[PDB]
């Protein structure tokens, strides 16, 4: 029994959201007291997601979006499969590390547009319909240790995750970097279909009117679990600064041991210079059927901490600073 309320967004704000975000064509929902924001298909799959059966030897990466999930997934997958770079190259990351809730963002009306554009390639159409189905099925079939990506906040996780004491890597990135990256993602992915500019998109981000917001609640619930035996909390920013330390810390958490030389190999493999040319971690399967707008910046983009952003303005930076102070006041959360 899915225990939290699901309410369509107030109708006038829901209308504006439908005008700016063309990947959704029914409406947006807010979930529970915290008003967790999602497209209409959350109402439809809530029960499936909540009752999804975790296993004790699952490895879960939970993050707010564009907080360093893909980087972390590749690191973790290799650490838990004897650094098997060959298999990592030949199986896509989305197959090795399935995205639990991706299917929420594949609307019927929008899937009709993908199918029309691929309507001559039966395999391309079988792939597109599969994107519409919960990953949870293929995952339940698996008889090997599983790797699961989610942006579901702690409080919206399948309860079997903590019940089974499965391992969770929670990664947090700073709001400024997340806002700019998230905007690019919303323009890149036709499943989102965002048309407006960064100023408009930041205003939606600040009002928690983007998928998986409230951002600050997502981070607080993360931080609140970081003392648990089965949780590892890390800042993207520290992971960028000291890879050898990140890899070794992550390996220790998962109960794995590797030589200075294996860590060195992993540093080369996970450097952005090599990673952005890596077949298995760029979304080649998705770009092949036209789900990605090719024009935009790429799912593996820059990977910088507080790097140059043309989109960012003094007025947005000052609001981001204020929004940071109202939310982090009387907590010990500090981005490095
Ligand atoms: N090998 C790597 N090193 C550092 N950052 C990486 C990386 N691969 C991907 N990223 C960055 O992680 C962010 C996306 O995170 P996620 O996987 O959670 O969507 C993007 O941020 P930018 O758009 O700031 O470059 C992306 O470029
Ligand atoms: C491939 O990763 C993602 C895809 C989407 C598409 O709507 C949203 C969030 C993600 O993290």
Short mmCIF file of N, CA, C and O in Angstrom, two decimals, residues 74 77-78 81 83-93 96 269 278-281:
data_model
loop_
_atom_site.label_atom_id
_atom_site.label_comp_id
_atom_site.label_asym_id
_atom_site.label_seq_id
_atom_site.Cartn_x
_atom_site.Cartn_y
_atom_site.Cartn_z
N UNK A 74 30.15 3.86 -12.84
CA UNK A 74 31.24 3.17 -13.56
C UNK A 74 32.30 2.77 -12.52
O UNK A 74 32.79 1.63 -12.60
N UNK A 77 30.73 -0.19 -10.34
CA UNK A 77 30.54 -1.41 -11.15
C UNK A 77 31.89 -2.13 -11.28
O UNK A 77 31.93 -3.35 -11.03
N UNK A 78 32.93 -1.39 -11.64
CA UNK A 78 34.28 -1.97 -11.81
C UNK A 78 34.83 -2.50 -10.48
O UNK A 78 35.30 -3.65 -10.47
N UNK A 81 33.31 -5.93 -9.74
CA UNK A 81 33.48 -6.94 -10.82
C UNK A 81 34.96 -7.02 -11.20
O UNK A 81 35.28 -6.98 -12.40
N UNK A 83 37.53 -5.25 -11.59
CA UNK A 83 38.11 -4.27 -12.55
C UNK A 83 37.98 -4.80 -13.98
O UNK A 83 38.91 -4.57 -14.78
N UNK A 84 36.87 -5.46 -14.31
CA UNK A 84 36.68 -6.09 -15.64
C UNK A 84 36.31 -5.01 -16.65
O UNK A 84 35.12 -4.92 -17.02
N UNK A 85 37.33 -4.28 -17.13
CA UNK A 85 37.23 -3.18 -18.13
C UNK A 85 36.64 -3.67 -19.45
O UNK A 85 35.89 -2.88 -20.06
N UNK A 86 36.98 -4.90 -19.88
CA UNK A 86 36.50 -5.50 -21.16
C UNK A 86 34.97 -5.55 -21.18
O UNK A 86 34.35 -4.96 -22.08
N UNK A 87 34.38 -6.23 -20.20
CA UNK A 87 32.91 -6.33 -20.02
C UNK A 87 32.31 -4.94 -19.82
O UNK A 87 31.22 -4.70 -20.39
N UNK A 88 32.97 -4.04 -19.07
CA UNK A 88 32.48 -2.66 -18.85
C UNK A 88 32.37 -1.96 -20.20
O UNK A 88 31.36 -1.28 -20.43
N UNK A 89 33.31 -2.19 -21.11
CA UNK A 89 33.30 -1.56 -22.46
C UNK A 89 32.13 -2.12 -23.31
O UNK A 89 31.40 -1.31 -23.91
N UNK A 90 31.90 -3.44 -23.31
CA UNK A 90 30.99 -4.11 -24.29
C UNK A 90 29.54 -4.18 -23.81
O UNK A 90 28.69 -4.44 -24.66
N UNK A 91 29.24 -4.04 -22.52
CA UNK A 91 27.83 -3.89 -22.02
C UNK A 91 27.58 -2.42 -21.65
O UNK A 91 28.30 -1.84 -20.84
N UNK A 92 26.57 -1.75 -22.26
CA UNK A 92 26.18 -0.40 -21.83
C UNK A 92 25.98 -0.26 -20.31
O UNK A 92 25.54 -1.22 -19.64
N UNK A 93 26.31 0.92 -19.77
CA UNK A 93 26.18 1.24 -18.32
C UNK A 93 24.72 1.11 -17.89
O UNK A 93 24.50 0.57 -16.78
N UNK A 96 24.22 -2.57 -17.39
CA UNK A 96 24.97 -3.04 -16.21
C UNK A 96 24.45 -2.42 -14.90
O UNK A 96 24.68 -3.04 -13.84
N UNK A 269 41.01 5.64 -16.36
CA UNK A 269 39.70 5.20 -16.92
C UNK A 269 38.59 6.22 -16.61
O UNK A 269 37.71 6.40 -17.46
N UNK A 278 34.17 7.17 -23.91
CA UNK A 278 33.85 5.78 -23.48
C UNK A 278 32.45 5.42 -24.02
O UNK A 278 31.47 6.06 -23.63
N UNK A 279 32.41 4.45 -24.92
CA UNK A 279 31.20 3.95 -25.64
C UNK A 279 30.09 3.56 -24.65
O UNK A 279 28.92 3.88 -24.92
N UNK A 280 30.44 2.84 -23.58
CA UNK A 280 29.48 2.18 -22.67
C UNK A 280 28.81 3.19 -21.72
O UNK A 280 27.75 2.86 -21.21
N UNK A 281 29.38 4.38 -21.51
CA UNK A 281 28.87 5.31 -20.45
C UNK A 281 28.19 6.51 -21.09
O UNK A 281 27.45 7.16 -20.38
#
